[PDB]
């Protein structure tokens, strides 16, 4: 479920990535706080690949 | 197919290299039973002679338990780590090679937990580690250290990328070999 | 040189954007300018600019201001040393019924005042007008006590349907302390008005001229 959301953030439709995380984990608090951790890791991936 | 962190557990050492490792260790094994007691009793008697007690220097020795080994690895006080490859729950030391990669601590995967057990009075020991050794043996250590780290640390990339198993049984190997032989043999069947 | 490629991404730091633009050879003057993409940037329809900025130095392009009048700017013209004229004939800086022949824009900035708001092409005339940009409305200046404002070329951001404007962030010879303030005082409003949906995956590009305009995060 993390990898799927990471791919959906790769295509960058955050309003669907959030819905995916919510419908699986449950609480909008947790989905909001978890999309941040999925980003800032995808960001690290791209940043260290272009490096 | 075993995962990468499990398939790392199958490129164990070369036998003769392990033999140098063990012959090194057997001058370093800790104190076993009926030795402990005699040394301690003699030390109690040296107390009245002011030349030895329980608190006095012990030359460098082994560090066996997983908790102790991981503690001193994450404090970077380890110069060599050995790992028994066949451990009952693999999750005990699945992480360990990654830790050694993180902190540059040389580490090797030996066959058998029984040998590490024989390295003490106990029956088995998941890992052992040299922190420091007698200087006269430091070079002999360092040569084996280089031989180990050449193969287990610098290629952590391919190790973690590795996959395993997936090897199809000989029955099906022959069964597919029939049709591969047939197609290779009669290829170019049409005038094409 | 026939190079347009900025293959960089390019991340170094948020405020260290002053240490990577300095690719200097041009013994002429290098218009080290600034621009940004068009994807999800509607050239005219639903998205456009109004933001303000102030540079320090006039680059190679002529960044000077003059008449109109539209009072207090008659006095500004007579003080900033340009002949001033109200309506007599639209022959100051036009492109068709002109007086002199310099660069088609003849300058890179002309502000407004508050008698009417479409009188710029009627007083000094076209230029940016002929190029399809409008220097007559939304100038955000009146400058009755500021001439150093125009000789440091107080300027703006403004839409265009071709691609966009392109506004300079300094030169290489002048320090990078200039460029850092200029970028971080110009594109803060650009980040505000273009980072609402477009999340800035690619970068804001610097027209760092002489054959290598690039970008920096």
């Amino acid at each position: 479920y993390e990898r799927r959301a990471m791919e959906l953030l790769k295509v960058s439709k955050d309003k669907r990535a959030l819905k995916f995380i919510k419908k699986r984990v449950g609480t909008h608090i947790r989905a909001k706080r978890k999309r941040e951790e999925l980003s800032s890791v995808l960001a690290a991936m791209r940043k260290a690949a272009a490096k | 197919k075993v995962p990468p962190a499990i398939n790392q557990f199958t490129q164990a050492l070369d036998r003769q290299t392990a033999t140098q490792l063990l012959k090194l260790a057997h001058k370093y094994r800790p104190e076993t039973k009926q030795e402990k007691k005699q040394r301690l009793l003699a030390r109690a008697e040296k107390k009245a002679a002011g030349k030895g007690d329980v608190p006095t220097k012990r030359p460098p020795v082994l560090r066996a338990g997983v908790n102790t080994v991981t503690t001193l690895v994450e404090n970077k006080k380890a110069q060599l780590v050995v790992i028994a490859h066949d451990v009952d729950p693999i999750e005990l030391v699945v992480f360990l090679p990654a830790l050694c990669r993180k902190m540059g601590v040389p580490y090797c995967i030996i066959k058998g937990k029984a040998r590490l057990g024989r390295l003490v009075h106990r029956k088995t020991c998941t890992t052992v580690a040299f922190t420091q050794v007698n200087s006269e043996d430091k070079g002999a250590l360092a040569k084996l250290v280089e031989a180990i780290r050449t193969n287990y640390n610098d290629r952590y990339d391919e190790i973690r990328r590795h996959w395993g198993g997936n090897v199809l049984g000989p029955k099906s190997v022959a069964r597919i070999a029939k049709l591969e032989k047939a197609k290779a043999k009669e290829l170019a069947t049409k005038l094409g | 040189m026939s190079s347009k490629v900025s293959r960089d991404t390019l991340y170094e730091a948020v405020r260290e954007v002053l240490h990577g633009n300095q690719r200097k050879r041009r013994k002429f003057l290098e218009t080290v300018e600034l621009q940004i993409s068009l994807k999800n940037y509607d050239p005219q329809k639903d998205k456009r600019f109004s933001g303000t900025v102030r540079l320090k130095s006039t680059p190679r392009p002529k960044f000077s201001v003059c008449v109109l009048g539209d009072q207090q700017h008659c006095d500004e013209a007579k003080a900033v040393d340009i002949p001033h004229m109200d309506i007599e004939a639209l022959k100051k800086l036009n492109k068709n019924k002109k007086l002199v022949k310099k660069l088609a824009k003849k300058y890179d900035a002309f502000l407004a005042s508050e008698s009417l708001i479409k009188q710029i092409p009627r007083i000094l005339g076209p230029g940016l007008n002929k190029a399809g940009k409008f220097p007559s409305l939304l100038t955000h200046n009146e400058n009755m006590v500021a001439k150093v404002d125009e000789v440091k070329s107080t300027i703006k951001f403004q839409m265009k349907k071709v691609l966009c404007l392109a506004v300079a962030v300094g030169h290489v010879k002048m320090t990078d302390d200039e460029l850092v303030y200029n970028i971080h005082l110009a594109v803060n409003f650009l980040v505000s008005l273009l980072k609402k949906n477009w999340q800035n995956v690619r970068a804001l590009y610097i027209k760092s001229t002489m054959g290598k305009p690039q970008r920096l995060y």
């Binding site: - | 995962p3 908790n67 991981t70 503690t71 009952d88 729950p89 693999i90 699945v94 992480f95 | -």
Partner: protein, 136 residues
Amino acid sequence: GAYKYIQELWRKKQSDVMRFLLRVRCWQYRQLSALHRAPRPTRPDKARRLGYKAKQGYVIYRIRVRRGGRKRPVPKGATYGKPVHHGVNQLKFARSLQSVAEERAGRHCGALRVLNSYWVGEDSTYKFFEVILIDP
């Protein structure tokens, strides 16, 4: 601390060791008993965390339980009474499957007293618990 690493590992999932070593129990509970002694707590993390010490006198019995609802046992499934007390499909038992397992192992082995239990696998129609037991 090694047990910190082990803890974090068990907390995470999506590694196949569960699939590998769950069959190692599904086969053997059908070769040998569905209730049998293990010689070592497979999760020395969780056993110790619940309270365990490998001092002599401590046992663990790993035991299988069959999962599902609980169909109400009556002949031909039509229960006499007012029609809110019908219903035999969707009924749900009132104790944790972990608790059912614990009591099964306890009642099987007298002279051994329970201390706690924990989860080791869950196939499709089962649950693979294990119980820590003291020899009092």
